[PDB]
Amino acid sequence: TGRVSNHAELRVLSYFMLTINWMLSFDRDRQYPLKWILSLTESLTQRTTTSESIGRNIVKVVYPDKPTSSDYFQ
DNA sequence: TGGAGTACAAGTGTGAGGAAAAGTAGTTGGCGAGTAAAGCAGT
């Protein structure tokens, strides 16, 4: 395994990682307020029963290595 | 002005760890009554 991370779909996600910090930490424009971030993660960390979410709940089950895999108690 | 490198960032040389079903163990258990005669002992 060459440690260049030359996979194409792998590198799209880092572009989605570095953007979401830069567009929020350096915001002189005060268009993205802090209280909306306080209404994002509080509304995102919230379970629901759609079939995408139910199907996502199966995916947490199958992987045993990492934490946030014994998430079934909640 | 221009070099000692020392750093992170690129590389390639060196054997093994984890996966699993069928097949293979040591171990119990669960079988198939008469009426007659002659013989040689007997003494």
mmCIF file of C-alpha atoms (C1' of nucleotides) in Angstrom:
data_model
loop_
_atom_site.group_PDB
_atom_site.id
_atom_site.type_symbol
_atom_site.label_atom_id
_atom_site.label_comp_id
_atom_site.label_asym_id
_atom_site.label_seq_id
_atom_site.Cartn_x
_atom_site.Cartn_y
_atom_site.Cartn_z
ATOM 1 C CA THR A 1 0.000 0.000 0.000
ATOM 2 C CA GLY A 2 1.630 3.190 -1.226
ATOM 3 C CA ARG A 3 0.964 5.861 1.395
ATOM 4 C CA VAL A 4 0.045 8.526 -1.147
ATOM 5 C CA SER A 5 -3.751 7.971 -0.796
ATOM 6 C CA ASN A 6 -4.138 7.900 -4.572
ATOM 7 C CA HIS A 7 -7.710 6.595 -4.407
ATOM 8 C CA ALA A 8 -10.010 9.106 -6.055
ATOM 9 C CA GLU A 9 -13.087 8.686 -3.840
ATOM 10 C CA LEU A 10 -10.822 8.799 -0.778
ATOM 11 C CA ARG A 11 -9.554 12.273 -1.625
ATOM 12 C CA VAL A 12 -13.005 13.800 -2.299
ATOM 13 C CA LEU A 13 -13.796 13.408 1.390
ATOM 14 C CA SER A 14 -10.761 15.401 2.549
ATOM 15 C CA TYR A 15 -11.931 18.210 0.274
ATOM 16 C CA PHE A 16 -15.262 17.900 2.112
ATOM 17 C CA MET A 17 -13.368 17.910 5.444
ATOM 18 C CA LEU A 18 -11.100 20.919 4.927
ATOM 19 C CA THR A 19 -13.833 23.078 3.385
ATOM 20 C CA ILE A 20 -16.297 22.714 6.257
ATOM 21 C CA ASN A 21 -13.683 23.991 8.729
ATOM 22 C CA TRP A 22 -12.421 26.863 6.564
ATOM 23 C CA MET A 23 -15.894 28.195 5.725
ATOM 24 C CA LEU A 24 -16.752 28.337 9.454
ATOM 25 C CA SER A 25 -13.555 29.157 11.370
ATOM 26 C CA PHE A 26 -12.519 32.061 9.118
ATOM 27 C CA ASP A 27 -15.882 33.793 8.798
ATOM 28 C CA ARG A 28 -15.409 37.544 9.079
ATOM 29 C CA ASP A 29 -18.633 37.895 7.033
ATOM 30 C CA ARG A 30 -20.740 36.849 10.133
ATOM 31 C CA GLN A 31 -23.072 34.928 7.817
ATOM 32 C CA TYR A 32 -22.583 31.609 9.669
ATOM 33 C CA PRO A 33 -23.338 32.457 13.311
ATOM 34 C CA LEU A 34 -22.288 30.373 16.277
ATOM 35 C CA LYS A 35 -25.853 29.847 17.512
ATOM 36 C CA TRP A 36 -26.708 28.226 14.183
ATOM 37 C CA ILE A 37 -23.799 25.827 14.691
ATOM 38 C CA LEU A 38 -25.380 25.245 18.107
ATOM 39 C CA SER A 39 -28.559 24.420 16.152
ATOM 40 C CA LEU A 40 -26.740 22.216 13.604
ATOM 41 C CA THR A 41 -24.892 19.605 15.676
ATOM 42 C CA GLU A 42 -27.781 19.527 18.154
ATOM 43 C CA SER A 43 -30.120 18.819 15.239
ATOM 44 C CA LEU A 44 -27.663 16.480 13.487
ATOM 45 C CA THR A 45 -26.814 14.325 16.536
ATOM 46 C CA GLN A 46 -30.419 13.157 16.617
ATOM 47 C CA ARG A 47 -31.728 9.711 15.717
ATOM 48 C CA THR A 48 -34.545 9.062 13.266
ATOM 49 C CA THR A 49 -36.256 6.058 11.735
ATOM 50 C CA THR A 50 -36.015 6.564 7.995
ATOM 51 C CA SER A 51 -34.835 3.584 5.979
ATOM 52 C CA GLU A 52 -31.565 5.341 5.191
ATOM 53 C CA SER A 53 -31.097 5.859 8.931
ATOM 54 C CA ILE A 54 -32.274 2.320 9.741
ATOM 55 C CA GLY A 55 -29.913 1.066 7.051
ATOM 56 C CA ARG A 56 -27.194 3.265 8.532
ATOM 57 C CA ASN A 57 -27.900 1.669 11.911
ATOM 58 C CA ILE A 58 -27.004 -1.721 10.437
ATOM 59 C CA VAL A 59 -23.666 -0.336 9.278
ATOM 60 C CA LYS A 60 -22.666 0.699 12.803
ATOM 61 C CA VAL A 61 -23.391 -2.883 13.873
ATOM 62 C CA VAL A 62 -21.167 -4.781 11.457
ATOM 63 C CA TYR A 63 -17.845 -3.053 12.215
ATOM 64 C CA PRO A 64 -16.350 -4.352 15.496
ATOM 65 C CA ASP A 65 -12.956 -2.647 15.621
ATOM 66 C CA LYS A 66 -13.788 0.998 16.381
ATOM 67 C CA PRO A 67 -15.839 2.710 19.085
ATOM 68 C CA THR A 68 -19.214 4.235 18.227
ATOM 69 C CA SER A 69 -20.016 0.637 17.296
ATOM 70 C CA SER A 70 -21.556 -0.251 20.655
ATOM 71 C CA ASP A 71 -24.073 2.485 19.869
ATOM 72 C CA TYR A 72 -27.014 0.083 20.055
ATOM 73 C CA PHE A 73 -27.675 0.871 23.735
ATOM 74 C CA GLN A 74 -29.193 4.206 22.742
ATOM 75 C "C1'" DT B 1 26.943 33.672 -1.762
ATOM 76 C "C1'" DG B 2 26.813 29.456 -1.375
ATOM 77 C "C1'" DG B 3 27.680 24.890 1.018
ATOM 78 C "C1'" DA B 4 27.604 20.995 5.890
ATOM 79 C "C1'" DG B 5 22.521 18.134 6.193
ATOM 80 C "C1'" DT B 6 18.131 17.134 8.698
ATOM 81 C "C1'" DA B 7 14.163 16.901 8.165
ATOM 82 C "C1'" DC B 8 9.439 14.962 6.664
ATOM 83 C "C1'" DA B 9 8.180 12.567 2.346
ATOM 84 C "C1'" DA B 10 8.643 10.244 -0.593
ATOM 85 C "C1'" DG B 11 10.085 5.255 -1.903
ATOM 86 C "C1'" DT B 12 11.001 -0.532 -1.893
ATOM 87 C "C1'" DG B 13 13.159 -4.732 0.605
ATOM 88 C "C1'" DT B 14 11.530 -8.858 4.530
ATOM 89 C "C1'" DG B 15 7.130 -13.420 5.859
ATOM 90 C "C1'" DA B 16 3.356 -13.716 8.394
ATOM 91 C "C1'" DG B 17 -1.361 -13.315 10.692
ATOM 92 C "C1'" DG B 18 -6.217 -14.518 10.622
ATOM 93 C "C1'" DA B 19 -10.436 -17.334 8.281
ATOM 94 C "C1'" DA B 20 -13.241 -21.893 8.481
ATOM 95 C "C1'" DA B 21 -15.406 -25.648 6.934
ATOM 96 C "C1'" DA B 22 -15.370 -30.596 6.770
ATOM 97 C "C1'" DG B 23 -12.598 -34.205 8.309
ATOM 98 C "C1'" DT B 24 -10.511 -36.419 12.736
ATOM 99 C "C1'" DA B 25 -10.050 -37.334 17.251
ATOM 100 C "C1'" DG B 26 -10.820 -39.774 22.865
ATOM 101 C "C1'" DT B 27 -14.631 -40.189 25.050
ATOM 102 C "C1'" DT B 28 -19.381 -43.118 26.626
ATOM 103 C "C1'" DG B 29 -22.811 -46.092 25.306
ATOM 104 C "C1'" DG B 30 -25.469 -49.884 23.631
ATOM 105 C "C1'" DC B 31 -25.404 -54.051 21.414
ATOM 106 C "C1'" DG B 32 -25.404 -58.668 19.373
ATOM 107 C "C1'" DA B 33 -41.214 -93.023 34.022
ATOM 108 C "C1'" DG B 34 -41.440 -99.489 33.295
ATOM 109 C "C1'" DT B 35 -40.157 -105.265 33.096
ATOM 110 C "C1'" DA B 36 -36.943 -107.196 31.555
ATOM 111 C "C1'" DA B 37 -32.722 -110.246 30.980
ATOM 112 C "C1'" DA B 38 -27.236 -112.442 31.531
ATOM 113 C "C1'" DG B 39 -22.618 -110.793 32.623
ATOM 114 C "C1'" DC B 40 -18.722 -111.491 35.842
ATOM 115 C "C1'" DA B 41 -17.659 -109.880 39.261
ATOM 116 C "C1'" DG B 42 -18.770 -111.480 44.078
ATOM 117 C "C1'" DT B 43 -17.207 -115.098 48.291
#
